[PDB]
Amino acid sequence: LKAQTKTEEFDAIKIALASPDMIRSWSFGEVKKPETINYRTFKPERDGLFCARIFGPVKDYECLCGKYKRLKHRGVICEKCGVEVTQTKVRRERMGHIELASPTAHIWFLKSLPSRIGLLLDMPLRDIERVLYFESYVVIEGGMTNLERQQILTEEQYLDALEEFGDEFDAKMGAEAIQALLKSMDLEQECEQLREELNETNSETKRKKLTKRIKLLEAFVQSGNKPEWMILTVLPVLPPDLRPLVPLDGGRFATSDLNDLYRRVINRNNRLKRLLDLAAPDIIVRNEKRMLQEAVDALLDNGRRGRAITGSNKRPLKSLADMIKGGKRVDYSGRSVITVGPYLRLHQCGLPKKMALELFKPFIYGKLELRGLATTIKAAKKMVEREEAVVWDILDEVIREHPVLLNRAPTLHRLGIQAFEPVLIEGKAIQLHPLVCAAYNADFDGDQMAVHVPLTLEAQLEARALMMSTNNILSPANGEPIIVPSQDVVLGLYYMTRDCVNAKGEGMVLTGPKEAERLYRSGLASLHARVKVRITEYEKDANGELVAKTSLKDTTVGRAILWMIVPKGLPYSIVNQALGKKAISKMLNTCYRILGLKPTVIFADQIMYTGFAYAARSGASVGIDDMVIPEKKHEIISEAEAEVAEIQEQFQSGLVTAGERYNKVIDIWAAANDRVSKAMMDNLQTETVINRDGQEEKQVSFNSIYMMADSGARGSAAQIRQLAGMRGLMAKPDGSIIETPITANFREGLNVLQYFISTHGARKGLADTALKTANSGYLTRRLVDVAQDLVVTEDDCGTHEGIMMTPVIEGGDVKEPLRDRVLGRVTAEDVLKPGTADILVPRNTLLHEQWCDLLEENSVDAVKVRSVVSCDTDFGVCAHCYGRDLARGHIINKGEAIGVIAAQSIGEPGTQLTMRDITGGLPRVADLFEARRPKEPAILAEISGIVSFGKETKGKRRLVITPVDGSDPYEEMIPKWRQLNVFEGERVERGDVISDGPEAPHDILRLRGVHAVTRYIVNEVQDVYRLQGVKINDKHIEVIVRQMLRKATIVNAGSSDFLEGEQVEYSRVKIANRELEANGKVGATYSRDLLGITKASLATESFISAASFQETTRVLTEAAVAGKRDELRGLKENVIVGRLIPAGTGYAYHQDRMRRRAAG
Amino acid sequence: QSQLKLLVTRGKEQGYLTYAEVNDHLPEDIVDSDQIEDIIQMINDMGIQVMEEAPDADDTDPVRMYMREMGTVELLTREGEIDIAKRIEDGINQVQCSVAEYPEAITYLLEQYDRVEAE
Amino acid sequence: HARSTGSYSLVTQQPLGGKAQFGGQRFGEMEVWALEAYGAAYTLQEMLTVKSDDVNGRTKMYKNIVDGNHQMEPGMPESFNVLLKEIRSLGINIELEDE
Amino acid sequence: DKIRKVLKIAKEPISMETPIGDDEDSHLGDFIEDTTLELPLDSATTESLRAATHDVLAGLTAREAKVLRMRFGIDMNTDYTLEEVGKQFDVTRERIRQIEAKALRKLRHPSRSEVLRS
Amino acid sequence: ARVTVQDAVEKIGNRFDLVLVAARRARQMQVGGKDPLVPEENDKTTVIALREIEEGLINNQILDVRERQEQQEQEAAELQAVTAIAEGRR
Amino acid sequence: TPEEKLLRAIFGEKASDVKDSSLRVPNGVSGTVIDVQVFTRDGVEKDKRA
Ligand SMILES: [Mg+2]
Ligand SMILES: [Zn+2]
Ligand SMILES: [Zn+2]
């Protein structure tokens, strides 16, 4: 016995046509005058666009005239002027209407791609439907003689037919004529007779229009909307506050264009009303009616036909539709220039004093009034406005464990916004931890970040348990660590290794920590010698715990002292015995996988501190003598120019092909470039001589530059090769290469010519960067738009099938193995063992248990693994079938947000993708995801049969192959162009290659298989990331491909109507509920269909979600026609409405409310 | 034929949606702001089938359409005008005479006059 | 720049200033991607309603802050209520029914 | 000055949808601030003001709290005068004004309303 | 637990549910009957609840059950007024 | 508001029918005035300082 009539919680929103009476329901009065505000009193006119009696009062609680002022009469209307004295926000929510004389056609339901009023009526849009309502050619409204039912007549034909019969087939013209047409139309009887006629002896020569319209008519009739509402007779009015005319600075009002529109339509409508009472000349009245049509259409949606101008502005007027067709500012926020903060931890950030003071204003107020100090709220305001010492301490209390989340401009992935504990800093710049300085892709060139203050309690906990930096150790894209130490610190730890012979060395042994005392007290060096010490190692096995292991290993001073930082566990020493390069991150990774979060975090802070400190102690610099040039430079250059000289002489005397000597001489200079490069590196690498004991030995150069290169720290081979070696082949604006490479280098002088040559490379480099940077996000938007609705649900379903994972082997003819693509993956079922037993069924491949997949030798290189591609889930993703790859080490928590994180991880490295039988680059990625047919698609054998020619060029034609065997034939079409690969008589299998060219994903999915096409997409999209050298897990690719294969096509006979291509969601859930419902014969078999990202994203349940990205004027219209309703499970549509997101911290709420909406 | 064959055969699929192409390969008076939206609506989005929904739908201005019906001149001369005006006065006269026939119109005018003199 | 609470535009009740304070920072699509990725439902909730353009919400939650209660008590943003009125201003009708 | 006021009526005038800074993308009507609304700070101070007064009239007597409350008209809508209060309390005019002043005398030490003043 | 917060997820899986329950308890502390179990040590209610969850006390079923007892305490102990009202409209 | 009417009644009314809109140096910045200037309307009482 509920049935509440108030503004409570809603479970869904409904969209449909509006009856004239439906408009009257919103009407709080009727606009009747084009008047807005008074010319002198500046007061709302009587019945104008800004009435007070109709809409709302100007001032809050005082009426128009002034008979009533204060809260005494908040429910009673005024005597002199019926002005309901409530609020002024009432003026913002009140509707109102205008009631037109002659009917008017709604511009949307009239001319919006398909003519809704036309297709519903079966009548040409801009041809007939225009000429019959623009007062030109009269139309018929049903005749029982000579004339049909919807034919078009001229005035002459009208009077002729009227004379022949008349007074029994009367049919007007114009708007009301189309009204009587739609009104007379019987949706029910037509829905029957159309079904009858459009099924009688007709092949595929008609079925198109038949199925189309019948589905459309059935939809409209079942929608509930009456076709009468299509053209309106009562036009509603927008609230005044949503289109106000507010006085700016010193007069000069500011109004909305809608006021001009409504004023025009009101004027034209009034004249029409007046003409329908005075003398009524047909030309005059009909013209004014067409003008009313103009005004109404211009108000609803300009678009579209010339665009009504006026308003002095040469620009058009922003109609209603243009205000809803196509960035959320927020309080408690700020931004500033960022700065490095070495003394910070990983969970801390430097927040400026004055900045944090203004940010936590309301918190300071509350805490002040709570303790004492400030007698009242305004006292607190005055107390903080006059920064009075004690207030700062109170601030030190409010920001204590109150997380503040930071954000950078280009937010590519989840790690764009990370939370920190605010640390007050005497300054006006925002300091950041140098470890998470890579996740933001932030530099200190002058980049500036923004800060947000989690106000809500659960918002603070969300920031601490999710967005906190300490929880984001690993990258969501690849399992590898993301807060890994960078340039400065890594060069430091690289210097803390680097075993140098002798030089204050000798093997004076001690025990770990004591070595520190040895280092500070000089005497001994630091990079010697090697030297031996006692290392107390710790290891665990089987029953965990800890097992000591004291020994005597030969490390160095640096390794000895550095060992102190290493946590309890770990293999110890051997992780330090190496150096500082990539194992610097490997060490962090292993530490995380064998210890945990906290030990890894503190280890990260320690290694950062260590790196910085010892790097500072080192004092590595970059003098001009650090980049030593090879002596053989001029030699190699002369030799190369000698060879090219001979080639040019040969070209002079004919001999060699002069047409392509350009290429081979380029090979000469290219070889020479590699010669200079190899010479420079082999020199600058080792060098040195030292003098160990009895002198004479060789190590590796301590040449600063090399130290930077052999330890990450921004220093690559190519860059160094340009510094001391030579800048190789340079590009030319033509796209060609110049046959005179930059012989000189930056260490040397650079001639004006070759610099004017290199300027092209720099120009196109920056330009191309500017393109791919925006193009990357341009792809990301499509990825998110298509994927941001699926979330891991229903815990862990059954099913065992899944793509057989195998090491990506180009080693067929080039040798290149990668076998780490299986880890944190849930096993399909006991994937065998050269003997028996071993692997369990649903056992997720651990990080230590994937290392067990090496104890089964190189024999086992194939494992079946559950993936998101398969998974017999319905509207989500099985937790098992997904994996675990997060910043978290465990499996994904039930109700995460796989879609967005997948899209982000894919489109994040897009910044470093070079756009162009190998396209390659971001464009290649786009084409693979869009699933576009190649420029020269190959062909496959649909059914295994016997290959034979089917009439040599007898069409038409063009060759024909016919693989026939067992039963029934097939006739494929070969267009002569491009050869073949299978002679006549030979047999083929189900999906064999008979064109040896580019494969089409549609054909692969349609014939080869889903596992094959998904394997193709992932292994082809990865191959373009291999070249760019960007690590990205296959899980996410499989994730987007999952809903990339969302819909299918049914071919048989079931409750679903055959030709309709529907998603396997409704398909599977309905076929599961039909085998055991009444009969399996009341349902058909479906067929998976490959559709691109855009084509897939285009289709979606919610009309609001669609109204977001795709064309709003279309989606909103068509969704209006059929009584559709969003209810209401998507992310995006649940975001713009401003409620809890059906994922993460939500989900539980949605599940409860979802089950709650089962009672009715 | 012309429009259909040209549009379909050319746009396959014109790659970058080359708009500035077929809009010149169309008849009638050009440079309109009306026919524009009817081409940007078909090309993409509902591909393949939309290109079959275009022709079947393909199988303008207030003032220009106003001068059209005004085109029916039926102009007059001094003779014509005086003629029409004469018919006006004739009709009016017959109406007023028909009012004179009505006695209650006279007596009502009499009653309302006494109301006028009674102030 | 930093802003606790300031002025708002007449059209859309969104933060803006330059007359005494500074117009608040802009969130956006790039950021709501991240918040959805994390699962910060309440963080996005507030960042989309009370923290921005929820007329009564901002005031109610501000009072709850000075009283040291936090919580939220959100509501339908005017940046969607306006959308209702604008769509309803056309011949099309949208209603938010209960259950 | 008549001409001066005349020129303040000219022009439509300007529409909000006018581009200004040419940002992404600017609109004149987007810079127009709302003034009919009150600052959340101001609303909070007003509420705390109600509580403050509601707690200050507690340290008074009935024949003094009611007097000040009814005279200056608070928590009762319609405010009354010396006569309408002097009739409901027998003693008329000067007597009730005496008490009305005595309450104001009482408010010369507390700081709550003092700081709420500004 | 001012740096994970990871130890709490072990006691109750799904970091999201962790946030919900922890916010629930933190709400109980910030407004209403405070009474923490783990010593404060100058920590916000945000973290105090997390410290408890890590400690092993105060979970989801725990709060729900204690809420049941809370209702059985407010209702059953003050039923005299409710019954006296029950005889109001017969 | 009644409470505010009482409040000023307790500390002195002086409820002037005027507001306030004086040009103030924005919070944060601080410096020295080097030059003042006043452009008066053509037909307005010139100021003492002007
Ligand atoms: Mg930069
Ligand atoms: Zn009134
Ligand atoms: Zn599954």
Inter-chain CB proximity B56 and A209 less than 8 Å:
yes
Angle at A791 between CA A787 and CA A797, to 5 degrees: 125
Residue with tokens 């109700």: A895
Inter-chain CB proximity A115 and B57 less than 8 Å:
yes
- Cα(A145)–Cα(A150) distance, integer angstroms: 13
Angle at A636 between CA A635 and CA A638, to 5 degrees: 65
First to last CA, chain C: 45
The residues in C 35-94 lying below 8 A from A, measured between CB atoms, are: 35-55, 58, 61-62, 65-68, 70-72, 74-77, 79-83, 85-94
Helix (H) or strand (E) holding C94: strand C92-95
Distance A882 CA to ligand 3 centre (A): 7
- Beta-carbon contacts of A581 under 8 Å, excluding residues fewer than 6 positions away, are A490, A494, A710, A711, A712
* Residue A162 token pair: 């009227």
Domain that holds residue C84: 1-99
φ, ψ at A35 (rounded to 5°): -75, 145
- Measured in whole angstroms, the distance separating CA C64 from the mean position of its chain's CA atoms is 16
Angle at A151 between CA A149 and CA A154, to 5 degrees: 135
Closest CA to D57 of D8, D90, D106: D106
Chains C and E touching, counted as 3 or more CB pairs less than 8 Å apart: yes
Chain A positions in Cβ-Cβ contact with residue E40 (cut-off 8 Å) = none
Nearest to A382 among D15, D16, D118 (CB): D118
Residues paired with residue A931 on neighbouring β-strands, in sequence order: none
First to last CA, chain B: 82
* Residue A371 token pair: 């303790």
Residue A105's Cβ-count burial label (10 Å; 0-12, 13-18, 19+) is buried
Helix (H, G, I), strand (E, B) or coil at C1: coil
Q: Is position A500 annotated in a ligand binding site?
A: no
Residue with tokens 């409901």: D88
- Cα(A994)–Cα(A602) distance, integer angstroms: 60
- Cα(A977)–Cα(A841) distance, integer angstroms: 51
Count other Cβ atoms within 10 Å, centred on residue B19. Answer: 12
Chains C and D touching, counted as 3 or more CB pairs less than 8 Å apart: yes
Helix (H) or strand (E) holding C2: strand C2-3
User: What crossing angle do the helices spanning A597-618 and A583-594 adopt, rounded to 10°?
Assistant: 150
Show the 3-state SS of A718-761: HHHHHHHHCECCCECCCCCECCCCECCCCCCCCCHHHHHHHHHH
Chain F residues with a Cβ under 8 Å from any Cβ in chain D: 1-11
Q: Is position A349 annotated in a ligand binding site?
A: no
Experimental resolution (Å): 3.7
Residue E80, min C-alpha distance to chain A (Å): 28
- Beta-carbon contacts of A543 under 8 Å, excluding residues fewer than 6 positions away, are none
According to DSSP, residue A946 is labeled B
According to DSSP, residue A128 is labeled I
Chain C positions in Cβ-Cβ contact with residue D23 (cut-off 8 Å) = none
Kindly list the partner chains of chain E, i.e. chains with 3 or more CB atom pairs below 8 Å.
Answer: A, C
Angle at A293 between CA A291 and CA A297, to 5 degrees: 120
Q: Is position A51 annotated in a ligand binding site?
A: no
Count other Cβ atoms within 10 Å, centred on residue B28. Answer: 7
Strands (E), A473-569: 529-539, 547-556
* Position A867, amino acid: S
Inter-chain CB proximity C86 and A324 less than 8 Å:
yes
Dihedral, CA of residue D79, residue D83, residue D85 and residue D88, to nearest 10: -140
Q: How many CA within 13 A on the CB side of residue A735?
A: 1
DSSP A256-278: -HHHHHHHHHHHHHHHHHHHTTS
- Cα(A669)–Cα(A663) distance, integer angstroms: 10
- Cα(A1070)–Cα(A1077) distance, integer angstroms: 10
The Cα diameter of chain D in Å comes to: 72
CA distances from A759 to A141, A763, A796, A1099, C57 (A): 74, 6, 58, 47, 56
Kindly list the partner chains of chain F, i.e. chains with 3 or more CB atom pairs below 8 Å.
Answer: D
Q: Which of C70, C71, C72, C73 to mutate to test the interface with E (most CBs of E within 10 A)?
A: C70
Helix (H) or strand (E) holding C80: helix C78-88
Superfamily designation of domain A631-763: RNA polymerase Rpb1 funnel domain (1.10.132.30)
According to DSSP, residue C38 is labeled H
Contact C33, A334 (CB under 8 A): no
According to DSSP, residue A895 is labeled T
Among positive and negative, which fits the CA dihedral A1121, A1111, C37, A1137? negative
Show the 3-state SS of A1033-1085: CHHHHHHHHHHHCCEECCCCCCCCCCCCCCEHHHHHHHHCCCCCCCCHHHCCC
* Residue A324 token pair: 């809803």
Kindly list the partner chains of chain B, i.e. chains with 3 or more CB atom pairs below 8 Å.
Answer: A
Residue with tokens 């890594």: A490
Chain C positions in Cβ-Cβ contact with residue A466 (cut-off 8 Å) = 38-40
φ, ψ at F35 (rounded to 5°): -160, 125
Number of the ligand closest to the Cα of A876: 3
- Cα(A624)–Cα(A106) distance, integer angstroms: 77
What number of C-beta contacts closer than 8 Å exist between A and C?
A: 294
Inter-chain CB proximity B69 and A115 less than 8 Å:
no
Contact A589, A470 (CB under 8 A): no
Distance A587 CA to ligand 2 centre (A): 80
Residue B66, min C-alpha distance to chain A (Å): 7
Yes or no: is domain D37-118 CATH 1.10.10.10? yes
- Cα(A286)–Cα(A136) distance, integer angstroms: 10
* Residue A866 token pair: 């559950």
Nearest to B37 among A287, A291, A303 (CB): A303
* Residue A360 token pair: 């936590």
Contact A1151, A1127 (CB under 8 A): no
- Cα(D39)–Cα(D44) distance, integer angstroms: 9
Angle at A403 between CA A402 and CA A407, to 5 degrees: 150
What number of C-beta contacts closer than 8 Å exist between A and E?
A: 76
φ, ψ at B4 (rounded to 5°): -65, -50
DSSP A84-146: --S-SSHHHH---EEEEEEEEE-HHHHSSSS-HHHHTTT--IIIIIHHTTTTSS-B-S--SSS
According to DSSP, residue D29 is labeled G
In whole angstroms, how large is the CA radius of gyration of chain A?
A: 38
Domain that holds residue B52: 1-59
Number of the ligand closest to the Cα of A53: 2
Give yes or no for a cis peptide into A304 (omega within 30° of 0).
yes
Closest CA to A268 of A279, A284, A256: A284
- Cα(A707)–Cα(A685) distance, integer angstroms: 9
- Cα(D41)–Cα(A1074) distance, integer angstroms: 62
Dihedral, CA of residue A41, residue A47, residue A50 and residue A53, to nearest 10: 90
Closest CA to A132 of A108, A112, A105: A105
- Cα(A1131)–Cα(A208) distance, integer angstroms: 35
Kindly list the partner chains of chain A, i.e. chains with 3 or more CB atom pairs below 8 Å.
Answer: B, C, D, E
Residues paired with residue A350 on neighbouring β-strands, in sequence order: A423, A431
Number of structural domains found in chain C: 1
Q: How many CA within 13 A on the CB side of residue A798?
A: 1
How are beta strands A13-17 and A97-105 bridged, if at all? unpaired
Chain A positions in Cβ-Cβ contact with residue C38 (cut-off 8 Å) = 414, 417, 462, 466-467, 897, 1144
Chain F positions in Cβ-Cβ contact with residue D79 (cut-off 8 Å) = 2
Closest CA to A274 of A75, A428, A518, A101: A101
* Position A152, amino acid: I
- Cα(D41)–Cα(C66) distance, integer angstroms: 9
Strands (E), A444-546: 448-452, 529-539
Angle at A521 between CA A520 and CA A524, to 5 degrees: 95
Contact A476, A415 (CB under 8 A): yes
Nearest to D73 among F2, F7, F11 (CB): F2
- Cα(A937)–Cα(A1012) distance, integer angstroms: 17
- Cα(A780)–Cα(A903) distance, integer angstroms: 6
Residue A194's Cβ-count burial label (10 Å; 0-12, 13-18, 19+) is middle
According to DSSP, residue A471 is labeled G
Count other Cβ atoms within 10 Å, centred on residue B115. Answer: 9
Chain C positions in Cβ-Cβ contact with residue A901 (cut-off 8 Å) = 37
Among positive and negative, which fits the CA dihedral E69, E73, E79, E81? negative
Inter-chain CB proximity D12 and A255 less than 8 Å:
yes
- Cα(C81)–Cα(C97) distance, integer angstroms: 15
Q: What domains does chain E contain, in order, with CATH numbers?
A: 1-90 (3.90.940.10)
- Cα(A1090)–Cα(A658) distance, integer angstroms: 49
Chain E positions in Cβ-Cβ contact with residue A421 (cut-off 8 Å) = 2
- Cα(A392)–Cα(A386) distance, integer angstroms: 11
- Cα(A788)–Cα(A1025) distance, integer angstroms: 23
Closest CA to A782 of A919, A909, A906: A906
Helix (H) or strand (E) holding A672: helix A661-685
Residue in C closest to E19 by C-alpha = C40
Closest CA to A883 of A839, A846, A832, A933: A846
Helix (H, G, I), strand (E, B) or coil at B43: coil
CA distances from A265 to A99, A319, A357, A870 (A): 11, 13, 53, 58
Contact A290, B62 (CB under 8 A): yes
- Cα(A644)–Cα(A650) distance, integer angstroms: 10
Helix (H, G, I), strand (E, B) or coil at A329: strand
The alpha helices in C1-77, defined as continuous H runs, are 29-38, 41-48, 55-66
How are beta strands A430-432 and A333-340 bridged, if at all? parallel
DSSP A490-503: HHHHHHT-----SS
- Cα(A340)–Cα(A349) distance, integer angstroms: 10
Q: Is position A277 annotated in a ligand binding site?
A: no
Residue E73, min C-alpha distance to chain A (Å): 27
Among positive and negative, which fits the CA dihedral A1013, A1017, A1022, A1024? positive
Could you tell me the CATH number of the domain that includes residue B28? Answer: 1.10.220.120
Give yes or no for a cis peptide into A958 (omega within 30° of 0).
yes
- Cα(B74)–Cα(A281) distance, integer angstroms: 14
Q: Is position A191 annotated in a ligand binding site?
A: no
Answer whether A215 touches B (CB < 8 Å).
no
Closest CA to A1030 of A922, A871, A1153: A922
Helix (H, G, I), strand (E, B) or coil at A551: strand
- Cα(A953)–Cα(A100) distance, integer angstroms: 67
